[model samples]
Target: WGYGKHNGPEHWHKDFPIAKGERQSPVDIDTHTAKYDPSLKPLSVSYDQATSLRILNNGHAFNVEFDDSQDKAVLKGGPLDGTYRLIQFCFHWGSLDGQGSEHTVDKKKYAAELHLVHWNTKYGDFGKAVQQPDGLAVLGIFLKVGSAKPGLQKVVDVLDSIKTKGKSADFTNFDPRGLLPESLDYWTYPGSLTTPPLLECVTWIVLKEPISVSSEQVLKFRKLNFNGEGEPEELMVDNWRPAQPLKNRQIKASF
Candidate 1:
């Protein structure tokens, strides 16, 4: 369902009954309550620039799709049991700079959030992986408004080319690792996809350190349209799903 008033997040459970599942994602992180887990290994990320394929607007958010046919770009260690191939990366933001991030820190919202979507290799393919509890591992990085980030600038520069839904352009030689913070310390938990279908299969790893992006860059994202070429222009802003409840799960911090 769309993010409009008629069929927003609150109405999603009606269509996709799993929206109310125990492991639903984008939970507000109460840092004080996050337990330090010394056993958690440092996350390992190795990305091949050539695997960068195309960037497109998928109505909800803009995604930079990658070549996941091989384990060229993969995420391992940390809370994951096996190699998880990078499939795509996307962003969620708000209409204003004050709030946009799906997951918040102590109830504080940020300008935006980035998600590096990967699927467990043991499951064979992304489709099969998404159906299992340990199928996907999503790396989330929060974005605050500050100086323009050069890495993020690369993606922002191409926003104009894919301004409408279903529009895409060639995006190659771009390494997503450039968008991450210098520190890899993160908080992880069992959660689900923040969007529709809202499958309860994702293992959420949200970094504590936030990357910066200028207001201008975020404004460009707002200019993107959720509507298609002939439909009424609907700015793709406030596209983030609100934080869901934290049930029986405990967030583990890898400091």
Candidate 2:
């Protein structure tokens, strides 16, 4: 989660802060003729009939995670045997700001966000991926609030189960793909993981359109908790990194 001015994307890890990287994503794509990557494809991994997505019961703050073992199938067609491994999936949002999203586009902000964190299994763990450009692949999708998007309704359906401050529910029946739009065309770029240790192994595939999540849904996210059983009372706020500056990197759009 990329949160705070000194903590948000603006001042995130030194390598990819709001003003230091050569490129960044979540840009408000107006008329970019650059299409998504035809080469970079979706993984052939089939979701289990019973999903491994775990929702922590930390009542006020809930997080959902997918196991890498469950993700070892096919991605666009790479070495599915061991090229990637899912670390976790988290979100980024604000208390009540219209500019709640961690990433900014040409300075234009959006509503809220979600990040599907994965590491290049080519390395040992996420720690290794953090140090190399080819060591990570992050799926960045934005959420715009308004009329409820049915595709997102599935994720919201589970809110009640983990609504309490230290509660969790297993969303083993949902499909991650069901939560996304049909388009795979993305804004590709050479960037580091926005989170700490400031790893440079990330190759970004930022979607062109933000997946729909309603305002009411966004509000529910504010009700999430980041710790569990023995952890302290840390509210799940400021989980986003500040937007970084596009230094001199070339942004590759999926085409």
Evaluated at residue 150, the lDDT of candidate 1 is 90
Can you give the TM-score per candidate against the true fold?
A: 0.98, 0.71
- Candidate number with greatest TM-score: 1
Clashes of each: 0, 54
- Poorest 10 consecutive residues by lDDT, candidate 2: 73-82
lDDT, residue 155, model 2: 67
RMSD per model, one decimal: 0.9, 4.9
> Candidate 1: where is the Cα deviation over 4 Å?
none
Provide the global lDDT of candidate 2 against the true structure.
Answer: 0.58
Alpha-carbon local distance difference test for all models: 0.93, 0.58
